[PDB]
Design a protein around this ligand. Sequence first.
Ligand code: A1ICX
Length: 332
Amino acid sequence: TGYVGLKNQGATCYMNSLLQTLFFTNQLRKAVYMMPTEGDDSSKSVPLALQRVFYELQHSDKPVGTKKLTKSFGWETLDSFMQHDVQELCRVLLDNVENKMKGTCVEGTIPKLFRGKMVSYIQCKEVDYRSDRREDYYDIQLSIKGKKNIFESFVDYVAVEQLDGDNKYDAGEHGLQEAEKGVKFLTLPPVLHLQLMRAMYDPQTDQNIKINDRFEFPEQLPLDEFLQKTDPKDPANYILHAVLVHSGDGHYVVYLNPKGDGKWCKFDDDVVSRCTKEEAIEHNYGGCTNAYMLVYIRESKLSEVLQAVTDHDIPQQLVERLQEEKRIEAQK
Ligand SMILES: COc1cnccc1-c1ccc(C(=O)N2CC[C@@H](C(=O)N3CCC(O)(Cn4cnc5c(ccn5C)c4=O)CC3)[C@H](c3ccccc3)C2)s1
């Protein structure tokens, strides 16, 4: 493979899977390295700690650890991971980084990479009144129960809902109204984080029940037909980068093809093996082991996103600090 694993330090669950997905977002990695953590607290700093994991992933020949990172964002006490969805762990990390990059030359990399735009509208069926609000989004949550595949989930996602008796829209001056609500996509970003809604509410066992149902997703994904305006110059065609997997009800795993080239690996904690396309994609449709999150890259943008990273893409200042820091760790 040429690729190093992560040590599975706590019940950090999905974290290793997420870290790897993020690491192989090369345009993100190289921005991360440029963050000015010169005088950042060694242990309190989330942005430092991420630089450390990345550094190590790029250099270590031996499984990489996460303790200082876990501690940094204070997710240690058991339940810290269970209580949160994978996209929340993402948000925490990216938000920290987004903010650290403020006032620098790499200011703006996060939104640049992950933020798409969207419109929620309410349209009264009988009256002229229409509310329009554009929203930003860094990730998309798809319904799967009773959907075959991505297309059916996306369909549902932009589906029109009717606001009738009881759910009647309060149209302000025009009282209650039969009205229809929907969402529609203005843009998609270079990198597309999709989460599949496999946990749902239990009015019985009162826990999060996992839906192991088959759900189908393609290696290539066209989305122009979900846009308002399409663009000939750059269509919304997406390339499958990463499949975050979970089996049971739990072991966590992630398949990547880091260069987007269909050369897949399986990343299970310390153990990284090359794997077949089948093992990565169809084998994880489900029906138990199955995907819960996908990562697509916009074909047009692959080469900037997955731009090559050299060892000289780490500031030598940063290297110095980490090397010293590693050295001083000398147990009798
Ligand atoms: C015995 O306890 C242990 C001891 N030692 C180590 C580990 C444990 C464990 C304890 C519990 C484990 C477990 O099995 N859990 C808990 C976490 C949970 C998890 O990893 N999640 C991330 C993916 C997730 O966010 C995806 N997602 C995001 N947003 C959503 C939905 C649905 C609606 N919305 C708005 C959604 O499904 C769901 C939660 C697991 C899971 C996996 C797949 C599908 C559903 C749910 C279920 S493992």
